[PDB]
Amino acid sequence: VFLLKGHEDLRQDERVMQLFGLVNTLLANDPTSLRKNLSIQRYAVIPLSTNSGLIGWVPHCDTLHALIRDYREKKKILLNIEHRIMLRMAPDYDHLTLMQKVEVFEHAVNNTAGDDLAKLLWLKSPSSEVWFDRRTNYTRSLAVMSMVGYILGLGDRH
Amino acid sequence: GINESTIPKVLQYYSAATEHDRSWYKAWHAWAVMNFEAVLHYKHQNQALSKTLLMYTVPAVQGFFRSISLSRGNNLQDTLRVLTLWFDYGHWPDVNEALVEGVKAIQIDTWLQVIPQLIARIDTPRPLVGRLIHQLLTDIGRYHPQAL
Amino acid sequence: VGSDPVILATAGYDHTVRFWQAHSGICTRTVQHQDSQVNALEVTPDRSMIAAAGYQHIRMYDLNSNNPNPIISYDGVNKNIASVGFHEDGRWMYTGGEDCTARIWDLRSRNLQCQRIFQVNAPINCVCLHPNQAELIVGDQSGAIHIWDLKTDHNEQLIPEPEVSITSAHIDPDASYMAAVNSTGNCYVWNLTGGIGDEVTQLIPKTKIPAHTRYALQCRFSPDSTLLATCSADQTCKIWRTSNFSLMTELSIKSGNPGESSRGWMWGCAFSGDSQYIVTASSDNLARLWCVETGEIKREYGGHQKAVVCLAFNDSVLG
Amino acid sequence: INLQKAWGAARRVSKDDWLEWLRRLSLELLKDSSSPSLRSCWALAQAYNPMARDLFNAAFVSCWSELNEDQQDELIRSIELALTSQDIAEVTQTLLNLAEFMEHSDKGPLPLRDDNGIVLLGERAAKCRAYAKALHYKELEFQKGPTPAILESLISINNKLQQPEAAAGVLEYAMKHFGELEIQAT
Amino acid sequence: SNTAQRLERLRKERQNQIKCKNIQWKERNSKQSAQELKSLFEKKSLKEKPPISGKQSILSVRL
Amino acid sequence: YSTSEMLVNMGNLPLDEFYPAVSMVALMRIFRDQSLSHHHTMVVQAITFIFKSLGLKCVQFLPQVMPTFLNVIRVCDGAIREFLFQQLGMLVSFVKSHIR
Amino acid sequence: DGNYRITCHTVMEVLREHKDSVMAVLEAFVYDPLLNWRLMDALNKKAIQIINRVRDKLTGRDFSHDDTLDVPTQVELLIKQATSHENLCQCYIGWCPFW
C-alpha cells in the first residue's frame, strides 16, 4: 500500500530519509546507544516528478490529533475545551500583547488537567506488562527525534 | 588552530603515521580529511592559484579512495567527500587522471548509496567532468539496472 | 462629562471604558471601543481629551461633551501600541509600539513635521519621559534600556541583565531616582542624571530590591516621590519608600482559597495628589481603591464584564 | 444468591484447600450467571478445569452487576480477606487479573478499603514477582500526594525492573521539588 | 428600482462616517533641519527646581 | 493478540454480546488441539447452542468456528465424524446466506 | 528528568562525536543548485550561514557564540526554551500549544 501524492515536492523528503539512515548507523555501533535500542522509523519515499511522488503507507499507526479526538468524544468531552476557555476570557486573543497572552494561556492550562494521552495509552494495553514496555519505547523514541529534529531545524510539528 | 604553519606540521605527522601501519582506517581517513580541510583554508584566503590548491587536492582524492576500500559498509562520508572535490576541482587534468583510476579500483557496488547525488549533477556544463558521470552511471545500469 | 476636579477611568477586554468618581462608586459614562483591547490610557494635560491606544490605532475620546464615538483616531502603524504619553505643555505625543518603533506624534495641524522615529531591534514594552521633558527612556523585550535624548540624535544603551524582558520603567517627577522592573520581579533602581543643565545623561546602579517572585507588571512613583508601587503577577502590590527601600505597606487580593488558583493578576496602580490613596486595576473584572496606612480598601467598582488591564487617574495640581 | 456460601467458608487453611476453593468458586459462577452463553459452558468446565480459569473474569462481572449494594458489599470484604490470608502466587494472580479487568470496564474499578485499594494491591503484587502491576499502583498513589516513603519505594521497583535511568530521575525530583537535607543516604 | 435603494442606502451611512478625524502617518520628518532640531522638539524646559508641599487638598472634598 | 484483546474487552463491547464472544474463544482453544480428543464430543453440542440462542447475531463468529471446525472433521476419525456432520447440518440451518 | 533527559544526553554526545559524518550529508543537501530554491526565500550567501548555524549547534556555540557549552548544559537550555510559557503562547492556534 502506497500514498500517491499530488502537487508536492518529495525530493526534499527523500534527502532527509537518507540522513536518518546515517543516524541509525551511528546509533547502531554505539555500545551505550545500541543497548537502549534507539532508532528512527522510516518510510519509503519514491518521487516521480517535480510535483508528484509516491510515499509508502506505514500500517498500525494513527495521527496524534485523531487519537486524542476519539478519546474525548467517547468521554463526552468537547474537542476544543482549552480554546473555548481562552476566547471566553478574552475574545480578542489573537490581538493581545505578549504579556497579556501569557495570562490567558496560563489560566486555560490550570482549569483543565492535561492527562488525555496518559490515560489513552493505558486503556489500549491488554496487560500491565505490555503497558510498561510500550511506555518505555515512547519515552526514548520522542527524545531521539527531538535532538535530531533540532539539528535539522524541523518545524510545524502540529 | 589550523594556520599557515600548523597545517604543514600535522601533514608530516599524518603522512608518517600512514606508512608505519598501512591498511588502517583511522590513519588514511585522518590524512585524507586534513588535505580536504587544507584546501578549504587556502580557498578562503585568496577570495578575500592553480598550483597552490593542486598540491593538496590531488593527495586528497587518493587518500579518500584508499579509505573507501578499508571501510566496506560504513563509508558514506568517504564516498560523499569524493563528490565534493569531483564536482568542484574535478575539471583539472591532474584531478581527472586520479579520478579515472580510483573509480575502477573500488567496487561498483559502492555508488548505489550516492545515486541521488550523481543524478543531481548530470547537466554539468563542463565536458571534461560531465562525460565521466555518464560512463559511471552506465556501468551501474549494467550490474544493477533496477536501482537506477 | 470631565468637568470634575478628579476623574477616573477603567478599560479592558469588555470593549467599553467606564468613567467613575472617587466620591462614590457610581458609574457616569460608558463609551464604545470596538474590535480592540485597550493596552494603556492617559489624559491630555489640558484635561479636555483622553487617549486610548490599542492594536494599530490610537482612538481619542471627548470629555467635555457626551460623545460615545472616537472623534479623533490615528493609524499608520502595523502592530500594537505599548503606551502613550504627552508633553507637559501638550505639544507632541510620544508612543511606543510593538513594531520596535518609539516615535513622536505632532498635534499641530500644520506641516511642522515635529515627528521623530527611533528604531530598536526588539519590541518595546514601556516608554517613559524625563521630568524635564528633554530626554526619553525606551525599553525592549531584550532587557536593554535605551536612554534617548531629544536635543541630540544619540541614545545610550544600558542593560542590567540579558534574556529577561522588562515591563515598566518610570521616573519620579521630583527627579530623584529611576526605577525599572523585569519579567522576574527584580526592581533595579538607578540614581538619575546629576547634570540637570547640559543633560549629561549619566546613570549609576543604586540598589536592587528582591521582591515579586512571579512576573512584575508595572512600577510607578508618586507625585511627592516618596513612594514606589510595583505591580506583580502574584496578585500582590508592594509600596516601597525612598529612604532605605523598606516595605512601607504590602497589599494583596488573594482570597486564601486553593480552588481559585490565581483568579486574576494585578496590572496597574495610580496615586492621588497627596499620595495618600492608591487605585489598583486587577484582572478580576473590577478595580479597587486602597489606602497606604489602614490597608483596607475604601471603595470598589464593578461595572465591567471582562478584565481591566489599564486605568487613568489624575486630578488638579493642588494636593 | 448462593455465591456467598462459596465465599463464606472460613475453613480454608491448607494450600490445596485454597486451590479447591478457587475452582469451587469458579464453577459456581458459571452455574448461575444470568446468561445462557455462560451457562452452557458449565458442563464442559467440570470435565476440564483450565477452561473455567480464563472464564472467571467474564463470569464474575455478569453476576456482580445483578447483585444490589448490600449483597455486593459482602463480596468486597471477602475478597479483601482472601487477598490477605495466603501467600500462594497462583491464587493471587487470579485475583490480581480480576482487578485489572474491572479497571478497563466502563463501570469503574471495584470498591475496596481506600481509593479502590491501590495500596493493598501495590504491596500484594510485589511478593508475587509481578513488578509491572506493582509500579502502576505506586504511580497512582504518587498522583494524590507525594511522600518520601513513596519516592523510596519507586527507586527500589525500578532497580529490579532493569530501569536504572528511570530510578535516577526519581532522585532528581526529590533534590529540587522536595525538602532539602531530607534525602536518605541509602 | 433596485440600485436606487442601494444608492440612497450609501447616503444614509455616509452621514455618520464623516464624524471622525483621521490622521495618517506620512513618512516624513525634519531630516534636513539637523541644526534647527535644537528647538523644534528640543525645548528642554529645565525648571521647577523648587519644591512645593501639600495639605492633602486633593482628597479633602472627595472623602 | 486479538484473543488476548477480547479477554480484557479492550474494544468497549457492551456486556450484552461480550459473554458470547469470550465464551467462543475459550471453547475454540480446547478445539484446535488433538490432545483433548475426548472432549470434542461435548464442545460441539455447546457451540451449536450458542448459535441457536443468538439467532441473527452469530454471523460474526463464523470466521472463527468454521476454519477450525472443517479441519477437525478432516483429521478426526471413528464414530465422531458421523456425529460431527449432523452438528454441521444444524449450523448451516441457523446461518443461512452467510455460509457462502 | 528521568528516561527522557538521559536519552537526550546520549544522542547529543553521538552527534557531536560524529560531526563530520552528519555535516557532509547536510552540505550536499544545502549546496544543491536545483534543491535549495525553496530555502532561498550573493545567491549562495544564505546557504553559507545555514551551514554555520548547524556547525554551531553541533559545537555548543549556539545560545552564546562567546563560550562553548557541554552536553548537560546545552540540553538543559533546550528544555527551558521548549516548555516556557512565553514561547508557547506565541504559537499558532492550530499548532495546539495547550495540548
**C255 is written with which cell numbers?**
482570597
Kind plus residue range of the DSSP H or E element containing B100: helix B93-105
* 3-state percent helix, strand, coil for chain A, nearest multiple of 5: 55, 5, 35
A15 touches chain B (CB under 8 A): yes
Kind plus residue range of the DSSP H or E element containing C204: strand C204-209
**G92 is written with which cell numbers?**
499558532
Cα angle, residue A141 at apex, residues A137 and A146 outer, rounded to 5°: 155
Query: Could you give the CA distance from residue D48 to residue E41 in angstroms, rounded to a whole number?
Result: 102
3-state secondary structure of B146: coil
* Sheet of strand C81-86, all strands in order from the earlier edge strand to the far edge: C81-86, C92-97, C102-106
Query: Could you give the CA distance from residue A96 to residue A107 in angstroms, rounded to a whole number?
Result: 15
Query: Could you give the CA distance from residue G36 to residue G50 in angstroms, rounded to a whole number?
Result: 11
Residues 6+ apart with CB under 8 A from B22: none
Cα F25 → chain centroid: 8
Q: Where are the domains of chain C?
A: 4-316
* Interchain contact, C98 vs A89, CB within 8 Å: no
Query: Could you give the CA distance from residue E22 to residue E18 in angstroms, rounded to a whole number?
Result: 10
Q: Please name every residue paired with A52 in a beta bridge, in sequence order, or none if there are none.
A: A6
Subunits with 3+ C-beta pairs closer than 8 A to A? B, C, D, F, G
CB F64 within 8 A of CB F22: no
CB C38 within 8 A of CB A96: no
**Start-to-end CA span in chain B (Å):** 43
**B84 is written with which cell numbers?**
565534493
Query: Could you give the CA distance from residue F6 to residue F20 in angstroms, rounded to a whole number?
Result: 11
Cα angle, residue A31 at apex, residues G10 and B78 outer, rounded to 5°: 85
CA dist C279 to C10, C282, C314, Å? 11, 10, 11
Cα dihedral angle (F8, A72, G85, A145), rounded to 10 degrees? Answer: 50
Query: Could you give the CA distance from residue C254 to residue D27 in angstroms, rounded to a whole number?
Result: 62
CB D172 within 8 A of CB D183: no
CB A143 within 8 A of CB G8: yes
CB C266 within 8 A of CB C219: no
CB pairs under 8 A between A and C: 44
Region of E5 (left: φ > 0; alpha: ψ -120 to 50; beta: rest) is: alpha
CB C148 within 8 A of CB C133: no
DSSP track, B124-140: -S-HHHHHHHHHHHHHH
Cα angle, residue G39 at apex, residues G33 and G44 outer, rounded to 5°: 50
**Start-to-end CA span in chain E (Å):** 65
Query: Could you give the CA distance from residue C318 to residue C273 in angstroms, rounded to a whole number?
Result: 7
* Interchain contact, F7 vs D54, CB within 8 Å: yes
Amino acid identity for residue B146 in this structure? Q
CB B35 within 8 A of CB B59: yes
CB B110 within 8 A of CB B139: no
Amino acid identity for residue C68 in this structure? P
Nearest Cα residue to D22 out of D77, D95, D76: D95
Nearest Cα residue to D39 out of D22, D10, D20, D63: D63
Region of B38 (left: φ > 0; alpha: ψ -120 to 50; beta: rest) is: alpha
CB C129 within 8 A of CB C94: yes
CB G12 within 8 A of CB G71: yes
Q: Please name every residue paired with A45 in a beta bridge, in sequence order, or none if there are none.
A: A55
Chain A partners within 8 Å of G10 (Cβ): 32-33, 36, 38
CB D88 within 8 A of CB D21: no
Query: Could you give the CA distance from residue F42 to residue C78 in angstroms, rounded to a whole number?
Result: 84
Report the gap between the CA of D96 and the closest CA in chain G (Å).
28
Cα angle, residue C7 at apex, residues C1 and C10 outer, rounded to 5°: 95
Using CA coordinates, name the residue in chain G closest to B75: G21
CB C313 within 8 A of CB C270: yes
- Residue A56, annotated ligand binder? yes
CA dist B28 to B13, B25, B59, B62, B71, Å? 12, 6, 11, 10, 11
CB C308 within 8 A of CB C286: yes
CB C127 within 8 A of CB C137: yes
Query: Could you give the CA distance from residue E51 to residue C120 in angstroms, rounded to a whole number?
Result: 36
C18-24: long-range contacts, CB 8 A cutoff, minimum separation 24: C18/C301, C18/C303, C18/C304, C20/C301, C20/C303, C22/C272, C22/C277, C22/C289, C22/C299, C22/E59, C22/E62, C22/E63, C23/E62, C23/E63, C24/C299
CA dist G90 to A104, G87, G94, Å? 12, 6, 12
Query: Could you give the CA distance from residue C66 to residue D164 in angstroms, rounded to a whole number?
Result: 73
**B80 is written with which cell numbers?**
560523499
Nearest Cα residue to D15 out of D78, D93, D87: D87
Phi, psi of A46 (to 5 degrees): -125, 90
DSSP track, chain D: --HHHHH------SHHHHHHHHHHHHHHHHHS-S-HHHHTTHHHHHH-THHHHTTHHHHHHHHHHHS-HHHHHHHHHHHHHHHTT---HHHHHHHHHHHHHHHHSTT-PPP-SSGGGHHHHHHHTTTTT-HHHHHHHHHHHHHH---HHHHHHHHHHHHTTT-HHHHHHHHHHHHHSS-TT-S---
Cα angle, residue B66 at apex, residues B63 and B72 outer, rounded to 5°: 135
Amino acid identity for residue E37 in this structure? L
Nearest Cα residue to D174 out of D185, D158, D162: D185
CB D51 within 8 A of CB D59: no
- Residue A122, annotated ligand binder? no
CB C47 within 8 A of CB C90: no
DSSP track, C121-175: SS-EEEEEE-TTSSEEEEEETTS-EEEEESSSS-EEEE-SSSSS-EEEEEE-TT-
**A128 is written with which cell numbers?**
500491565
Phi, psi of C209 (to 5 degrees): -105, 115
Cα C221 → chain centroid: 10
Report the gap between the CA of A10 and the closest CA in chain F (Å).
36
**B57 is written with which cell numbers?**
587536492
* Interchain contact, A33 vs G11, CB within 8 Å: yes
DSSP track, C169-199: EEE-TT-S-EEEEETT--EEEEE--S-TTTT
CB C155 within 8 A of CB C149: yes
* Residue C210 burial (CB count, 10 A): 9
Query: Could you give the CA distance from residue A149 to residue B9 in angstroms, rounded to a whole number?
Result: 39
Query: Could you give the CA distance from residue E37 to residue F8 in angstroms, rounded to a whole number?
Result: 84
Query: Could you give the CA distance from residue B105 to residue B61 in angstroms, rounded to a whole number?
Result: 13
Chain F partners within 8 Å of A127 (Cβ): 4, 8
Nearest Cα residue to B12 out of B35, B40, B46: B35
CB C249 within 8 A of CB C293: yes
Tell me the HSE value of C319 on the side-chain side, using a 13 A CA sphere: 18
DSSP track, C13-57: TTSEEEEE-SSSS-EEEEEE--SS---EEEE-TTSSEEEEE-SS-
Burial string for C79-111 (b: 16+ CB within 10 Å, else e) reads ebbbbbbbbeeebbbbbbbbbbbbbbbbeeeee
Query: Could you give the CA distance from residue C46 to residue C63 in angstroms, rounded to a whole number?
Result: 11
CB E19 within 8 A of CB C71: yes
Query: Could you give the CA distance from residue G55 to residue G49 in angstroms, rounded to a whole number?
Result: 10
Amino acid identity for residue C247 in this structure? L
* Sheet of strand C72-74, all strands in order from the earlier edge strand to the far edge: C40-43, C49-53, C58-62, C72-74, E21-23
Query: Could you give the CA distance from residue C140 to residue B60 in angstroms, rounded to a whole number?
Result: 51
CB D148 within 8 A of CB A121: no
SS3 of D76-122: HHHHHHHHCCCCCHHHHHHHHHHHHHHHHCCCCCCCCCCHHHHHHHH
Phi, psi of A109 (to 5 degrees): -75, -15
Burial string for C4-40 (b: 16+ CB within 10 Å, else e) reads bebbbbbbbbbbbbbbbbbeeeeeebebebeebbbbb
DSSP track, F30-90: TTS-STTGGGHHHHHHHHHHHHHHH-SS-GGGHHHHHHHHHHHHHH--SHHHHHHHHHHHH
Using CA coordinates, name the residue in chain C closest to A109: C261
- Residue A75, annotated ligand binder? no
**D47 is written with which cell numbers?**
470435565
Phi, psi of B8 (to 5 degrees): -60, -30
Instruction: Kindly give the pairing relationship between strand E21-23 and strand C72-74.
Output: parallel
**B64 is written with which cell numbers?**
579518500
Nearest Cα residue to A4 out of A50, A62, A47, A58: A47
**C147 is written with which cell numbers?**
536612554
Query: Could you give the CA distance from residue G70 to residue G74 in angstroms, rounded to a whole number?
Result: 6
**D42 is written with which cell numbers?**
458449565
* Interchain contact, D132 vs A127, CB within 8 Å: yes
Kind plus residue range of the DSSP H or E element containing A148: helix A128-152
Q: Is the dihedral of CA F81, F86, F87, F88 positive or negative?
A: positive
Residues 6+ apart with CB under 8 A from A101: A93, G89, G90
Amino acid identity for residue C242 in this structure? T
Query: Could you give the CA distance from residue G14 to residue G22 in angstroms, rounded to a whole number?
Result: 10
Nearest Cα residue to C23 out of C36, C6, C9: C6
D170-173: long-range contacts, CB 8 A cutoff, minimum separation 24: D170/G2, D172/G1, D172/G2, D173/G1
Tell me the HSE value of C228 on the side-chain side, using a 13 A CA sphere: 26
Query: Could you give the CA distance from residue C74 to residue B109 in angstroms, rounded to a whole number?
Result: 71
Length of chain F: 100
Tell me the HSE value of A129 on the side-chain side, using a 13 A CA sphere: 6
Is F19 buried (19+), middle (13-18) or exposed (0-12) by CB count in 10 A?
buried
Q: Is the dihedral of CA C221, C222, C225, C227 positive or negative?
A: negative
**B93 is written with which cell numbers?**
587534468
Report the gap between the CA of E36 and the closest CA in chain C (Å).
10
Query: Could you give the CA distance from residue D160 to residue A120 in angstroms, rounded to a whole number?
Result: 27
R_g (Cα) of chain C, nearest Å: 19
CB D126 within 8 A of CB D86: no
Q: Is the dihedral of CA C272, C278, C281, C285 positive or negative?
A: negative
What DSSP designation does G15 have?
H
Query: Could you give the CA distance from residue C127 to residue C104 in angstroms, rounded to a whole number?
Result: 11
For chain A, counts of helices (H) and of strands (E): 7, 2
Q: Grid cell 444444524 — which residue?
A: F90
Report the gap between the CA of A70 and the closest CA in chain C (Å).
30
Cα angle, residue D109 at apex, residues D103 and D111 outer, rounded to 5°: 160
Q: Identify which of D44, D58, D101 has the shortest CB distance to residue F19.
A: D58
Select the residue from E19, E31, E44 to test the C interface by mutation, using most C Cβ atoms within 10 A: E44
Query: Could you give the CA distance from residue C204 to residue B29 in angstroms, rounded to a whole number?
Result: 58
Instruction: Kindly give the pairing relationship between strand C286-291 and strand C277-282.
Output: antiparallel
